[PDB]
């Protein structure tokens, strides 16, 4: 009932949903606990977001990060918006990535990713 | 007058400030058009930030952003903050990296840098 640009994700792997933006477990993490946040609507550049989209999308990109930084035992984190082809993006909707980090740090199952969700999910309570 | 964690900064070479949030070029840009966001307050983690805060943090992230894709024909844009050590942060200040991107795209004099900022500030006017 989400969708996050072509694809259309499942309630059960989105862990926050907002007035205008929602989380979602990655289904291909680079680190532990690599989720994204992204607004509701499905616009393709950041710069096509009204500016309240703006405020709510990195308002709530703020908690998750700070969740998942708690749940990882990461250090600290890294946040990273790949704004457009030649940025590096491939699904065409305005998405950040957000990443807990630990020091010297340098596909998954549709019932693990929901279990990394409720699990998340449990902290916006 | 303005102050990037330790460095206090200059006026001239700030291009834009709003009401909590400030922008300024790059004294080492990674590729042209390099610039930095950051809030007035020199919190040293994102989540120190208030909620205001944030929202006008990432709404003049959105302007700066495409303001330098325009002066710098990047084809897009890449947005990046590394929030605390470990992430990648050196100066402890939050502030957002923005960069504008080409096609297989892959310190400064405080004169010419002060051009590039003058030169910037006109697209705000």
């Given at each position: 009932?989400?969708?996050?640009?072509?694809?259309?994700?499942?309630?059960?792997?989105?862990?926050?949903?907002?007035?205008?933006?929602?989380?979602?477990?990655?289904?291909?993490?680079?680190?532990?606990?690599?989720?994204?946040?992204?607004?509701?609507?499905?616009?393709?550049r950041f710069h096509?977001?009204?500016?309240?989209?703006?405020?709510?999308?990195?308002?709530?990109?703020?908690?998750?990060?700070?969740?998942?930084?708690?749940?990882?035992?990461?250090?600290?984190?890294?946040?990273?918006?790949?704004?457009?082809?030649?940025?590096?993006?491939?699904?065409?909707?305005?998405?950040?990535?957000?990443?807990?980090?630990?020091?010297?740090?340098?596909?998954?199952?549709?019932?693990?990713?929901?279990?990394?969700?409720?699990?998340?999910?449990?902290?916006?309570?």
């Amino acid at each position: 009932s989400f969708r996050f640009g072509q694809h259309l994700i499942k309630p059960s792997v989105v862990f926050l949903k907002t007035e205008l933006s929602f989380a979602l477990v990655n289904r291909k993490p680079v680190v532990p606990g690599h989720v994204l946040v992204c607004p509701l609507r499905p616009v393709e550049r950041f710069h096509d977001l009204r500016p309240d989209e703006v405020a709510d999308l990195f308002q709530t990109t703020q908690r998750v990060g700070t969740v998942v930084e708690k749940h990882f035992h990461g250090t600290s984190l890294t946040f990273s918006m790949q704004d457009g082809p030649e940025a590096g993006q491939t699904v065409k909707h305005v998405h950040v990535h957000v990443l807990p980090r630990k020091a010297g740090d340098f596909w998954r199952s549709e019932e693990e990713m929901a279990a990394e969700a409720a699990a998340l999910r449990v902290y916006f309570q």
